Amino acid sequence: PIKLARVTKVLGRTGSQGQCTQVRVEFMDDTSRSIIRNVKGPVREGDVLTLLESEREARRL
């Protein structure tokens, strides 16, 4: 199912060339879940994202 979720805080640029951003993401329908996601493109606090499959958390060192 398609899910929607607000960015809370950005953790920082991740990836080999710094092409992704690791970020703290929380849902709006239930403002209790809190996940780590990695995104492509410029992000800031207050952006809201369309998550296709909202189970796993992103992971990069």
Partner: peptide, 25 residues
């Protein structure tokens, strides 16, 4: 601390880099 080492090894560093790129009269 072992907790700090594991958390820092599992997270990403961020922040410090200063890039220098780029009327009244």
């Amino acid at each position: 601390p072992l907790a700090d080492q594991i958390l820092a090894g599992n997270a990403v560093r961020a922040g410090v880099r200063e890039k220098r790129r780029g009327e009244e009269y």
